[PDB]
Amino acid sequence: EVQLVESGGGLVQAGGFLRLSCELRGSIFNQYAMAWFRQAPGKEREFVAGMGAVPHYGEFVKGRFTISRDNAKSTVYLQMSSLKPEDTAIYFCARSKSTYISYNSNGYDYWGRGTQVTVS
Amino acid sequence: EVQLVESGGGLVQAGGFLRLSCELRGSIFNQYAMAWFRQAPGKEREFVAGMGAVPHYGEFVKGRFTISRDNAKSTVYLQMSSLKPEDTAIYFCARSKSTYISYNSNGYDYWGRGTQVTVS
Amino acid sequence: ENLWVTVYYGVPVWKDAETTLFCASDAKAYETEKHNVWATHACVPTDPNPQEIHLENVTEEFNMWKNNMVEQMHTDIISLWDQSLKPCVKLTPLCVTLQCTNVTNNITDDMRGELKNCSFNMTTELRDKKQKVYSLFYRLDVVQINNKEYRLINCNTSACTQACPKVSFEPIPIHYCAPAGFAILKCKDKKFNGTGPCPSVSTVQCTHGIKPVVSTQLLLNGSLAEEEVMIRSENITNNAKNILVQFNTPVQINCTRPNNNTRKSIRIGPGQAFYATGDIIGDIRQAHCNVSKATWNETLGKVVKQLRKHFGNNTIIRFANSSGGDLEVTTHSFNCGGEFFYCNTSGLFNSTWISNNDSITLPCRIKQIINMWQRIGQCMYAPPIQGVIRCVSNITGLILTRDGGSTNSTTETFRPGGGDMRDNWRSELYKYKVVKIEPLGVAPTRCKRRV
Amino acid sequence: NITDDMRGELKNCSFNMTTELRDKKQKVYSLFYRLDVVQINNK
Amino acid sequence: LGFLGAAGSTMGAASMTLTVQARNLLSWGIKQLQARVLAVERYLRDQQLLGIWGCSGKLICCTNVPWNSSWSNRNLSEIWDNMTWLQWDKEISNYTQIIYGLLEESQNQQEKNEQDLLALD
Ligand SMILES: *[C@@H]1O[C@H](CO)[C@@H](O[C@@H]2O[C@H](CO)[C@@H](O[C@@H]3O[C@H](CO)[C@@H](O)[C@H](O[C@H]4O[C@H](CO)[C@@H](O)[C@H](O)[C@@H]4O)[C@@H]3O)[C@H](O)[C@H]2NC(C)=O)[C@H](O)[C@H]1NC(C)=O
Ligand SMILES: *[C@@H]1O[C@H](CO)[C@@H](O[C@@H]2O[C@H](CO)[C@@H](O[C@@H]3O[C@H](CO[C@H]4O[C@H](CO)[C@@H](O)[C@H](O)[C@@H]4O)[C@@H](O)[C@H](O)[C@@H]3O)[C@H](O)[C@H]2NC(C)=O)[C@H](O)[C@H]1NC(C)=O
Ligand SMILES: *[C@@H]1O[C@H](CO)[C@@H](O[C@@H]2O[C@H](CO)[C@@H](O[C@@H]3O[C@H](CO[C@H]4O[C@H](CO)[C@@H](O)[C@H](O)[C@@H]4O)[C@@H](O)[C@H](O)[C@@H]3O)[C@H](O)[C@H]2NC(C)=O)[C@H](O)[C@H]1NC(C)=O
Ligand SMILES: *[C@@H]1O[C@H](CO)[C@@H](O[C@@H]2O[C@H](CO)[C@@H](O[C@@H]3O[C@H](CO)[C@@H](O)[C@H](O)[C@@H]3O)[C@H](O)[C@H]2NC(C)=O)[C@H](O)[C@H]1NC(C)=O
Ligand SMILES: *[C@@H]1O[C@H](CO)[C@@H](O[C@@H]2O[C@H](CO)[C@@H](O[C@@H]3O[C@H](CO)[C@@H](O)[C@H](O)[C@@H]3O)[C@H](O)[C@H]2NC(C)=O)[C@H](O)[C@H]1NC(C)=O
Ligand SMILES: *[C@@H]1O[C@H](CO)[C@@H](O[C@@H]2O[C@H](CO)[C@@H](O[C@@H]3O[C@H](CO)[C@@H](O)[C@H](O)[C@@H]3O)[C@H](O)[C@H]2NC(C)=O)[C@H](O)[C@H]1NC(C)=O
Ligand SMILES: *[C@@H]1O[C@H](CO)[C@@H](O[C@@H]2O[C@H](CO)[C@@H](O)[C@H](O)[C@H]2NC(C)=O)[C@H](O)[C@H]1NC(C)=O
Ligand SMILES: *[C@@H]1O[C@H](CO)[C@@H](O[C@@H]2O[C@H](CO)[C@@H](O)[C@H](O)[C@H]2NC(C)=O)[C@H](O)[C@H]1NC(C)=O
Ligand SMILES: *[C@@H]1O[C@H](CO)[C@@H](O[C@@H]2O[C@H](CO)[C@@H](O)[C@H](O)[C@H]2NC(C)=O)[C@H](O)[C@H]1NC(C)=O
Ligand SMILES: *[C@@H]1O[C@H](CO)[C@@H](O[C@@H]2O[C@H](CO)[C@@H](O)[C@H](O)[C@H]2NC(C)=O)[C@H](O)[C@H]1NC(C)=O
Ligand SMILES: *[C@@H]1O[C@H](CO)[C@@H](O[C@@H]2O[C@H](CO)[C@@H](O)[C@H](O)[C@H]2NC(C)=O)[C@H](O)[C@H]1NC(C)=O
Ligand SMILES: *[C@@H]1O[C@H](CO)[C@@H](O)[C@H](O)[C@H]1NC(C)=O
Ligand SMILES: *[C@@H]1O[C@H](CO)[C@@H](O)[C@H](O)[C@H]1NC(C)=O
Ligand SMILES: *[C@@H]1O[C@H](CO)[C@@H](O)[C@H](O)[C@H]1NC(C)=O
Ligand SMILES: *[C@@H]1O[C@H](CO)[C@@H](O)[C@H](O)[C@H]1NC(C)=O
Ligand SMILES: *[C@@H]1O[C@H](CO)[C@@H](O)[C@H](O)[C@H]1NC(C)=O
Ligand SMILES: *[C@@H]1O[C@H](CO)[C@@H](O)[C@H](O)[C@H]1NC(C)=O
Ligand SMILES: *[C@@H]1O[C@H](CO)[C@@H](O)[C@H](O)[C@H]1NC(C)=O
Ligand SMILES: *[C@@H]1O[C@H](CO)[C@@H](O)[C@H](O)[C@H]1NC(C)=O
Ligand SMILES: *[C@@H]1O[C@H](CO)[C@@H](O)[C@H](O)[C@H]1NC(C)=O
Ligand SMILES: *[C@@H]1O[C@H](CO)[C@@H](O)[C@H](O)[C@H]1NC(C)=O
Ligand SMILES: *[C@@H]1O[C@H](CO)[C@@H](O)[C@H](O)[C@H]1NC(C)=O
Ligand SMILES: *[C@@H]1O[C@H](CO)[C@@H](O)[C@H](O)[C@H]1NC(C)=O
Ligand SMILES: *[C@@H]1O[C@H](CO)[C@@H](O)[C@H](O)[C@H]1NC(C)=O
């Protein structure tokens, strides 16, 4: 069975630091690409970051974030930094159909529960 | 089945340039050695060039020629250069019995059709 | 009235199951010695015209979306490509700082920063000496570090082996045959939508010519449908599932690389050779592809008409260009003559349909190295091919991904997509399933075993 | 402020090493236990 | 007339040709070897299961153990003329691995009754 977990997140001061994680347990780790989606209240899902064979980021990341996948633990991290208050939203974790990343939400078939992140 | 296919050759001006080739299709290329024999009119066959693990040349080559075998395409090339009129003859291609080259014609068991080369 | 039980060995009955299949390759090419991927030198030779015998009064249900042969086939290709790269040569010595600059031999205005002329020191056959060789690398294979100081893009993630010149990447058909005790069914209904009972099912010991093709979208050289362009899906209501459109009449596509590339050999070490692009002869022209304007518009007409049976008749169906993301999903990466292409497709999926001669030209890009779909880590190096590469192919199907719009706003937008690399084969293994025979059944009759 | 229990147990070693690029080199350091290093001939 | 060439026909008519479905049952390189070992192994299992019963290779092994009307409750002539084997298997698929036990008991019990019968002479 394919299932995913997530890190804590939690409240973070404006301009602070935070790290997320997502462990892929069921399927093989070196045969799929993982990516993170955010869903602000009253808005649809959109791409944030994703690591296949080459990193990708959204238009609003502007290099603030950093994404890397540890092959040993079979997890993908997200070294977010300097979180503006507009970034508050629920950050999901999803696995792509294959080793490529597509910005549309319909390119993934195994989502996560969702991690709550807020900035004040 | 073991068979060989030669190159064009054809008439070439004296002191010109030419290139011959011979592709071995049936047997394994990396367990046999090829060689080239010429038969001038009214004369017996004699050695010209051959490549096993170390190149060899005939007495009249005098370093003018150059022989090399491409393992990828399973073919042996022979770089003619400075063709004197006395070099006109039918240039055969033959496969040695095993991994070695002998200047006697009886050291080969699969001959080619014969390439005609003329110099004027 | 008393009747007893009996057991009938060798009775025809089967149950769904899975197992491991094996070689079936044509013996015609055996004489042509080629130790390439998808090997024939190590196989059971195929059989001419296998025992394809029809069945009557039989009803069987197929389900390709949960088929096991496609999953089994995938692990086969993964385990094969790795085996074919072991004898090749690594590229660890090549990860060196490069001094590069633009190349301008009256280059065309279409591309300016596409070819970089790089020179770097390198070890010769004797380690005491070093040589200063030069080569041309595409702009997608070099990054700047700090001016002119570039390195190969893959020299900080994972080194990878050169593709052996001996092997070839062209598609060799691979038939699949079941082992003793098993049998492979084969549906034959023309109006077969992937799932559901197939009335005229027939058995066969071996599948037809199956050529696995490495493509992301617009899968090439597929098996044409008989009639009535089909739309095979899993949960068409859900938009997260792909839609493998397969049409009967193919549209021919011509792809060429007008650049007159010349190969140059450089010695890695003793017995290790590395090939690099030499000097481009003649003018430089962008690699492109062509598809007939008239046929393509008609082909989309069939797909749109056949797609309305699921979304009603008064629906404004309009196509849109690719999604946007990894370079191998935005374009379609198809192998052609040993070189990997990347062809922009925004010129095809651009139109809108209401329910009331010329040739399309598109650009393409080429990458010498590729992060192979087999695994995330290892890359690959594609040696250059001399002369001009041109290859024609049959575009037989499409891989469309629907857009998750609102229930209102009946304009439903489809987008080309893919990259799964399992759906490519699923379009070719949608007819077959593997079954296990279960002899020695039990039936009632009348006997008395004499003592 | 190492404890008096052990003095010559952890050694702070630094050595040149090849980076991802074959041409360049980097000076990195690490700590090795006393049972993994021997003297040759000082430090 | 071929391998599984009468699967959809009448079960009574399916018995006309039973050897074709049995003869063609026993006939990356590691994959081939594993399949062959599995293929031969499966055939041995089936033959052994027939061996423990009152037959070895007769190919029509009619046993004397009583039949149950509850298992099928279908008329004898009603099922042997129209219904096919595949449909028949599903009807009594649930009632499997129980008749097999009965057959073994009806054979081992009978075997000794024959052995001592030949000994009283
Ligand atoms: C879909 O099917 C089509 C139909 O086959 C296929 O087109 C084929 O492309 C290959 C590309 O290599 C063609 O093969 C080449 O043809 C040229 C023509 O001049 C030859 O010169 C080539 O020979 C050289 O390269 C070989 C590569 O191994 C060497 O072995 C050889 O010694 C030469 O150096 C080579 O044979 C092939 O002819 C066409 N098929 C045709 C024209 O019918 C297309 O590629 C398929 N689609 C995909 C995505 O592959
Ligand atoms: C050995 O030394 C380590 C380095 O000092 C010790 O790690 C410390 O562990 C504690 C508790 O586990 C941390 O205290 C927490 O700090 C976070 C803030 O850290 C955030 O940033 C880091 C940066 O990577 C990130 O990893 C975290 O997840 C957080 O996002 C607070 O939010 C918590 O409330 C809590 O106070 C220390 O921060 C951490 N040290 C450092 C330098 O980060 C380790 O505990 C030592 N081992 C033992 C056995 O004591
Ligand atoms: C890309 O550039 C290449 C280099 O210019 C082009 O190769 C040219 O190909 C043509 C026809 O195939 C040749 O014209 C022939 O020349 C021979 C004489 O060449 C002899 O010497 C060469 C040296 O190796 C040898 O390979 C030949 O086999 C011959 O032995 C004439 O005899 C013929 O009649 C004919 O004129 C050119 O000579 C050749 N160029 C060079 C520099 O040799 C190639 O065609 C270009 N690609 C495209 C698509 O145009
Ligand atoms: C292997 O090398 C590549 C190429 O440098 C690394 O990716 C690159 O990493 C750098 C920083 O490590 C990124 O620089 C950043 O770029 C953004 C703009 O995208 C800029 O706003 C930032 O200020 C920063 O300069 C760079 O973007 C990124 N990508 C490319 C194409 O250069 C990669 O991280 C290396 N591998 C490992 C494991 O570190
Ligand atoms: C690997 O090294 C050997 C040794 O040099 C190469 O064979 C030698 O190649 C040279 C020129 O490449 C030959 O020189 C020629 O010698 C003749 C006399 O035989 C002379 O008349 C010419 O003017 C020229 O100087 C040499 O004969 C030849 N053999 C030996 C024993 O040195 C070999 O080609 C090298 N391998 C590769 C793949 O290049
Ligand atoms: C990539 O750049 C390197 C150096 O920046 C180029 O190396 C040299 O390029 C010249 C012409 O661009 C080649 O021809 C030379 O021309 C001079 C003109 O006087 C002549 O005197 C020389 O005898 C020679 O013919 C030269 O061969 C080449 N160097 C080598 C070692 O081949 C290189 O050409 C550039 N790449 C391309 C594709 O242009
Ligand atoms: C593929 O065809 C099968 C039957 O040929 C379809 O099966 C039924 O489809 C209807 C709707 O078209 C559903 O209401 C039924 O529940 C389905 N029954 C079964 C047993 O599947 C199937 O829906 C078709 N699928 C697609 C994607 O067109
Ligand atoms: C693809 O089509 C384009 C036209 O859009 C072709 O480009 C022309 O090809 C002819 C061939 O002789 C040249 O004379 C022209 O100069 C080219 N350009 C234009 C603007 O017409 C291209 O050759 C075609 N390629 C293939 C492989 O079919
Ligand atoms: C792709 O190339 C093929 C062959 O090079 C073209 O097919 C030929 O088209 C011409 C058009 O005048 C016909 O006269 C020939 O009979 C065709 N031959 C074959 C074998 O098909 C094809 O037209 C090219 N594609 C496009 C879009 O132009
Ligand atoms: C593929 O080609 C199309 C055009 O054929 C490109 O579309 C361009 O999109 C940008 C984005 O705003 C526009 O500024 C350009 O004007 C468009 N092109 C033209 C000719 O108008 C598309 O960008 C190409 N694909 C990629 C990945 O660049
Ligand atoms: C995609 O389709 C649109 C039409 O829906 C094309 O829009 C036209 O583009 C041409 C070429 O630039 C212009 O001359 C027309 O004026 C455009 N139409 C309108 C109404 O303004 C668009 O060009 C197509 N994309 C590409 C790359 O050709
Ligand atoms: C299929 O059944 C029909 C009637 O049930 C019968 O006439 C026909 O012969 C059967 N098929 C075959 C191949 O015998
Ligand atoms: C070289 O090409 C780049 C684009 O790839 C361009 O920005 C630059 O001006 C060109 N010239 C030089 C000297 O780099
Ligand atoms: C090769 O080594 C020499 C040694 O001084 C150096 O000057 C030159 O820059 C090196 N080549 C490159 C491309 O860096
Ligand atoms: C298709 O997806 C929708 C989405 O909610 C779901 O309601 C429906 O049950 C799914 N159908 C199938 C056959 O999976
Ligand atoms: C353009 O560049 C090509 C590339 O070799 C060359 O053959 C040709 O002579 C050049 N023509 C002009 C006008 O510079
Ligand atoms: C495609 O064909 C339809 C009808 O066949 C026509 O209405 C439409 O204009 C055509 N589109 C193009 C781009 O030729
Ligand atoms: C849609 O069109 C098809 C054929 O054009 C027709 O059979 C069907 O009844 C139509 N349905 C509606 C709702 O108009
Ligand atoms: C698709 O078209 C849009 C139109 O703005 C463009 O921005 C995007 O880059 C195109 N996608 C590709 C892959 O070219
Ligand atoms: C494309 O399809 C046509 C029609 O079936 C066929 O004749 C042709 O050989 C196909 N092209 C290939 C196999 O390259
Ligand atoms: C370091 O530790 C050793 C014991 O391992 C001791 O003999 C020596 O005096 C210490 N100080 C220096 C400078 O080596
Ligand atoms: C590393 O190389 C430099 C080059 O001069 C040298 O001075 C230094 O001592 C080396 N590092 C070590 C630990 O010896
Ligand atoms: C027949 O089946 C019933 C219930 O399934 C069971 O109680 C009975 O013992 C069985 N009798 C025989 C002879 O198998
Ligand atoms: C088999 O019978 C049991 C109880 O009689 C029942 O629970 C089960 O669902 C049946 N299964 C099938 C496949 O008929």
C347 C-beta closer than 6 A to ligand 11: yes
Per-residue burial over C66-85, b = 16 or more CB atoms within 10 Å of its CB, e = otherwise: ebebbebbbebbeeebeebb
What does the angle CA C67 – CA C70 – CA C71 come to, to the nearest 5 degrees?
A: 90
| DSSP per-residue codes, C354-408 | -----EEEEEEEE-SEEE-TT-SS-EEE----SEEEEEEEEEEEEEEEE----SS
For chain B, the chains sharing at least 3 beta-carbon pairs closer than 8 angstroms are C
Beta carbon pairs, A and C, within 8 Å: 70
| Ligand 15 site residues, Cβ closer than 6 angstroms | C 235, 237-238
Domain containing E70: what range?
A: 4-118
Residue nearest to atom 37 of ligand 1 (CA): C391
Residues 6+ apart with CB under 8 A from E95: E71
How close is the nearest chain C Cα to the Cα of B47, in Å?
28
The residue type found at C381 is Y
Helix-then-strand count for chain D, H and E: 0, 2
Could you say which DSSP state residue C164 is in?
P
CB contact under 8 A, B72 and C33: no
C193 lines ligand 7 (CB under 6 A): yes
Q: How many domains does chain E have?
A: 1
What number does the ligand 23 atom closest to the CA of E102 have? 14
The resolution of the experimental structure, rounded to one decimal in Å, is 3.6
Domains belonging to chain A, first-starting first, are 4-119 (2.60.40.10)
Phi, psi of B86 (to 5 degrees): -70, -15
Task: Pick the closest to residue C102 from C111, C112, C93 (CA basis).
Answer: C112
Say which DSSP state C349 is in: S
C418 touches C242 (CB < 8 A)? yes
Among chain B residues, CA nearest to C166: B72
Measure the CA–CA gap between E30 and E27, rounded to whole angstroms. Answer: 18
List chain B residues with CB under 8 Å of C33: 25, 28-29, 74
Residue in the block written with tokens 């089936």: E46
A56 interaction partners in chain C (CB closer than 8 Å): 325-326
C397's CB contacts (< 8 A; 6+ apart) are C218, C219, C222, C244, C245, C246, C247, C427
Query: Which residues face C354 on adjacent strands?
Result: none
State the Cα–Cα distance between residues E20 and C331, nearest whole angstrom.
52
Residue B18 and residue C252: Cα distance in Å, rounded? Answer: 40
Q: Do chains D and B touch (3 or more CB pairs under 8 A)?
A: no
Rounded to an integer, what distance in angstroms lies between the CA atom of residue B115 and that of residue E48? 68
User: Is chain B touching chain C, with at least 3 CB–CB pairs below 8 Å?
Assistant: yes
Going by alpha carbons, the residue nearest to atom 5 of ligand 22 is D16
CA distance B27 to B35: 15
Experimental determination technique? cryo-EM
* Residues whose beta carbon lies within 6 Å of some atom of ligand 8: C 254, 256, 290, 359, 361
Distances (CA, A) of C351 to A29, C217, C292, C321, C413: 39, 18, 16, 9, 10
